[PDB]
């Protein structure tokens, strides 16, 4: 009876399997943003997250990824073009596991995203929350240990596989 | 700019 999609990332450390993280996507609250992430996880539009890396990881903050075009952390594109408007700001950054959109100002949402590892209320109203870690948060915690204070990672944290579970 | 990094930096 209408159920929020569930997608997974199989995380790899320099090609070594680390573990699976699954996300609920709040299609009920933000349909356009949830669908962007869902389809980039399946690649069903011809492009998506598979093979991309988490290029900025700041312990105590978040794990950022989603640039599958240039891979340097400046690229990425949505399924609607290269950017789409801020759908809404209903859902908040309530704690670890929150899935939020990175941007460069209002209405500049692309494909880059971050997984919060803490409460980040000072992001409310500027970045669109669209999902939340369902399971595998212990895997996200391990990814955090490869980060640094400026986000540089000490190994290649890549999305070795991704897709949809539900 | 990366607004969430700049927010983290200001905080
Ligand atoms: C893109 C954007 O919104 N950047 C930004 C700059 C400065 C601050 N300052 C504080 O939070 C105190 C927030 C966001
Ligand atoms: N800060």
Residue among A149, A160, A159 nearest A60 (CA): A149
Between CA A27 and CA A17 the distance in angstroms is: 29
Query: Which run of H or of E encompasses A138?
Result: helix A137-144
Between CA A73 and CA A135 the distance in angstroms is: 26
Instruction: Give the chain B residue whose CA is nearest to the CA of A120.
Output: B8
CB A112 within 8 A of CB A56: no
The owner of tokens 């340097």 is: A72
Instruction: Give the chain B residue whose CA is nearest to the CA of A118.
Output: B8
The data reach a resolution, in angstroms, of 2.1
Ligand nearest the Cα atom of residue A126? 1
């Amino acid at each position: 009876g209408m159920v929020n999609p569930t997608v997974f990332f199989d995380i790899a450390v320099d090609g070594e399997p680390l573990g699976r993280v699954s996300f609920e996507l709040f299609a009920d609250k933000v349909p356009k943003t949830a669908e962007n992430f869902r389809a980039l996880s399946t690649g069903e539009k011809g492009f998506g997250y598979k093979g991309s890396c988490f290029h900025r990881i700041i312990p105590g903050f978040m794990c950022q990824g989603g640039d599958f075009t240039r891979h340097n952390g400046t690229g990425g594109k949505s399924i609607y073009g290269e950017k789409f408007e801020d759908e809404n700001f209903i859902l908040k950054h309530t704690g670890p596991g929150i899935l939020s959109m990175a941007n460069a100002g209002p209405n500049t949402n692309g494909s880059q995203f971050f997984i919060c590892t803490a409460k980040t209320e000072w992001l409310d109203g500027k970045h669109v929350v669209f999902g939340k870690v369902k399971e595998g948060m212990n895997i996200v915690e391990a990814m955090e240990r490869f980060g640094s204070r400026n986000g540089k990672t000490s190994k290649k944290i890549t999305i070795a596989d991704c897709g949809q579970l539900e | 700019p990366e607004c969430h990094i700049e927010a983290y930096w200001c905080i």
